[PDB]
Amino acid sequence: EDPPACGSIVPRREWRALASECRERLTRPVRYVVVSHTAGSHCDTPASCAQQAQNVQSYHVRNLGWCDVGYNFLIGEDGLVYEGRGWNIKGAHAGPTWNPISIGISFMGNYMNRVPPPRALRAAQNLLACGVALGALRSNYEVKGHRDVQPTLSPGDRLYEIIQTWSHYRA
């Protein structure tokens, strides 16, 4: 809807993503953002992190039979944003009540005992700012933790504490 093409996202073709088979859309503008962690291995290079975003799309498509990597976006400790289902497609990351009404972004790693570095954190916020800018998210969007909407450890205590300090965070 709006002119400013936004942030910096590693496109699907760049991290070598299997093609999506997903077709259902979200109604723009979206009101909620659920933050999670892959609880998998972390990476801190554009190289390892492309691999990673690939291993995760993989486990989701090849092992759980999803139409594509479950999150709308992933975040690398290389401080880069990875492209998933994107802004317009419904994701599979927070159960049936929430998947139809939110954008799910997952930090690649397990933040039970680690805080993601500032660049990781920075990517995520810009991403959200971009979402608003784009008209994808409501200007007064709300950020929820995974655990606030499903029973789980995600996004990890550390990262959990951190997103609780964010201006759009509503528990």
Added chain:
Amino acid sequence: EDPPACGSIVPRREWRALASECRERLTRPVRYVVVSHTAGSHCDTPASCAQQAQNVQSYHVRNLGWCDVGYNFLIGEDGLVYEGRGWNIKGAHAGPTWNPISIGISFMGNYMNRVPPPRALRAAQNLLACGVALGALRSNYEVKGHRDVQPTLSPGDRLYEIIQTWSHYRA
């Protein structure tokens, strides 16, 4: 304190920069943008690249007497943007004529025979977009090649042919 800088810029402090001692101020919103390469080693991980930003600054300050690292902004092959002098302070990257009326961004590496990764080209443009938003660049701003305004090879034949392809490029 509030959301970070659009463009996800690595702050002076995060790459361990020496404090700047420059005072001369630019008049945001600026009209020109000049692209150059450091002609130093390239780096491609957040680690490698912080050290390189540190390196180039140490050079400019410890050795060329400069008040701060010359450039307004530096770009790494890790695809991150490194804060240099910023939006407000006159740089030292294109001489008397151009240092006061343009913002200088520099790609870390020699790009005479290497093209830099697309993620670098991305942080660059997104860098500029976020320049109008925060309002440091004039919306209709123009891009010039370091060699388009000084007797220099920089930014290298490869980078240079690309920035030529650009939209808000010029002359």
Added chain:
Amino acid sequence: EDPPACGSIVPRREWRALASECRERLTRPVRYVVVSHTAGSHCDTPASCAQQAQNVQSYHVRNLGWCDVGYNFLIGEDGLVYEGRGWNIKGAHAGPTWNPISIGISFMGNYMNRVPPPRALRAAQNLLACGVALGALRSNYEVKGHRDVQPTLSPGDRLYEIIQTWSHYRA
């Protein structure tokens, strides 16, 4: 397992209300009840009151970009109780400290110089009785006036006057 058919409430479907997008829950039995007035135009018939509810919701949803009309229930001067966020969804009518521990019912009208007609008042008391039979409210719930918890003229002076006399009212 004792069910009363105490619900003489007009469902949203019946007043042609837009779908709510709220998901935050109230934990019953709720201890507090806050009374406000729209401060807007009042209605005296089931058909215009349905229209008025629509309006109140439109303002909160389109104008203030809220997930749904802020009150749990609305009382029309037509003597009917209009369903808002209902008994189990945290309203948005008295701030961060009261919203999550109270039911916010609001009288559709401006009561700074009118008293609501007896039937509107009967409607409200019976609504509360209802909520007690269901267990949604504590049998010993406390009623506050809007101005008692936030700076507002709400619920209007003559209405404020009346609820102060009420059995469940509390300092």
Added chain:
Amino acid sequence: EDPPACGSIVPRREWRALASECRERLTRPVRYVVVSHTAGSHCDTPASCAQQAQNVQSYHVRNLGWCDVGYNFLIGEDGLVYEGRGWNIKGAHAGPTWNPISIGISFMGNYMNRVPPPRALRAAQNLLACGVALGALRSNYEVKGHRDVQPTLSPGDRLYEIIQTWSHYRA
């Protein structure tokens, strides 16, 4: 041409405010100004208005039990600005989405059918020019009407109507 240069404000002691006790801080520079009116009575003498101030504060501190008057600044029709919570302390005047990112200013009176006089209008636009000079407010800050972000008639049709003409009004 030299530092300390803007707007006259009646300080707390001068009007006998109760010692504030609020600790939470706004982050400067602030982007939003939310305009409200007290919804009570006006005043037009340094004597009455300073009395006015106290009352308002009494309600918010005695009655609502808050840590200090809700607004950051009040305008009296006496033509003076009464120090509210200052440029640095989060106030309670517009709900939790805006309290942490706005400066809230309230005209002391009710402006539904009545408009405030040239001088209150001047004290207010002087306070803002001053907020900008101090870097308490962003240079390109935005002004909202209270009713634009909360359900309320505040700031009154006549006043609301007026601020809409304002240079920094953002619908």
